[PDB]
Symmetry: C4
């Protein structure tokens, strides 16, 4: 069933990985199949301990929706994006936990910094994992994300077979 | 058999969705299969009643042909398109019903307005559903539509398997 | 076995269609499969007789190789290409028959003219089928051809399945 | 099992070919499958002996990683790349053998030169295979490599099926 093949970037302070998560479908009794739980592109950040040694137990995740992916793949050399996620957004527990993912270009255009910030007011913690990403590394993402977008949207269920 | 996974945009005045409809094939007796009923990318518009509440019963559709899709995916930030459809085009009942879909950019380049106008002289009605679409949302469409184009054209039947 | 789903453009003087032809493989005894007869993108031109009536019996073909496809999909608004094919190229019967396909832009950038010229010195004939192609129509080709390129190259045989 | 369909360029001094090599997976007992041995795009160079006659026995290989592919597909007309590979990189036998692949544009922008240099201090040899590649030929590579990137990354294992 399960499948694992993330694209990973391992840098000085932290490690970064990315993988699609396909949407789930509830087969209706009326016939065929219907899309249920949304697909995303999952990003995982985690800290470096030893030199090129990382603590997988301190990992934090950030799910990119289809639209956030569209925003990413349409970034030029000089562009930035910032996405803001509250796992408990739109309720009383909103504000307790805030995740913000930012993607900023270097002044020289030699790549980007992809940073995940996690503020937890419940646990009283404040984490920031930053991973530099080269122009070529980021090209791999745009291309792979672009490939995966239709799949996470469930559009690959439309083939003439 | 059937498959449902539209990409949807829900805004103030109306909701917008899009999904490929694959072409149909009549298997000839001579052998193989032949393309019959054309594929399109189907757009569905429908009105907002309550706040983020929409009336699916007042929905109107607009089928984009392969060529109209090509026109869409090749739109720059500052481009516009207008497509004109008469469900009874090229007969006496032509003019009775007119659908026009327009896609116009915002002055600031923060996205587009995608509007469906429906004029029915038979029922004496005049409807206009407008849905704003962000740069990123529109990027999702171009990419998904681009992915689907070969499939709606029936070209995916050409794989080495 | 066979599969038919060309993309077609029907204009004043002639009709134009395009479809991939997949490569053939000779399964070696040593194991697996090996690519044999090359894939191409086949273009078919044929004359208009009545208004929107065409003579399929007077059709002429032009096979685009992978590299010619690469040349096509990488054409800008103002670009041209000309391809020259001798069905009996590189022998004594070379020169007997010459096919040249040209793709030229309109001055206004509203599209292209795609023209097939066929000179037969054996039969003493000289044919020229010209078909105007809009910006959007040509966008459909670039996208569909681009999709098909890996398939006609046989690269789709490399999937993780 | 095996599959062969390289894209090949045959020129004056040497021949060049390219083909994806898919990644390998070790099916875990816990369930599903996990990516193991990395995918690459394999380049093979080999010398010309007679006119359009080549010595396959003197071939040298250069494996492009996913990231090197990303660097390639994101090359403009005026760009260059150089990749440096030591088959025994990061050990005592490092430096014994060095492979460098370069891709340089022509002054006129009529294409590129793709050159593999192999220095072997063990055997005391110094080889350089150079193959000119046209704009259109290089367009075929970018497109085919781009198609294959997700497959060599193992992302095609994520389809809704």
């Amino acid at each position: 069933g399960r499948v694992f093949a993330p694209y990973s970037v391992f840098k000085g302070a932290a490690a970064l990985s990315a993988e699609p998560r396909l949407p789930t479908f509830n087969r209706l009794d009326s016939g065929g199949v219907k899309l249920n739980r949304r697909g995303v592109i999952m990003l995982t950040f985690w800290p470096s301990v030893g030199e090129r040694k990382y603590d997988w137990e301190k990992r934090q995740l950030f799910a990119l929706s289809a639209t956030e992916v569209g925003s990413l793949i349409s970034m030029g050399t000089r562009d930035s994006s910032e996405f803001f996620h509250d796992p408990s957004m739109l309720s009383s527990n909103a504000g307790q936990v805030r995740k913000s993912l930012s993607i900023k270009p270097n002044a020289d255009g030699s790549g980007y910094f992809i940073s995940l910030s996690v503020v937890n007011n419940n646990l009283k913690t404040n984490d920031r994992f930053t991973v530099p990403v080269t122009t070529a590394e980021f090209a791999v993402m745009r291309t792979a994300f672009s490939f995966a977008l239709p799949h996470i949207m469930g559009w690959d269920r439309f083939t003439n077979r």
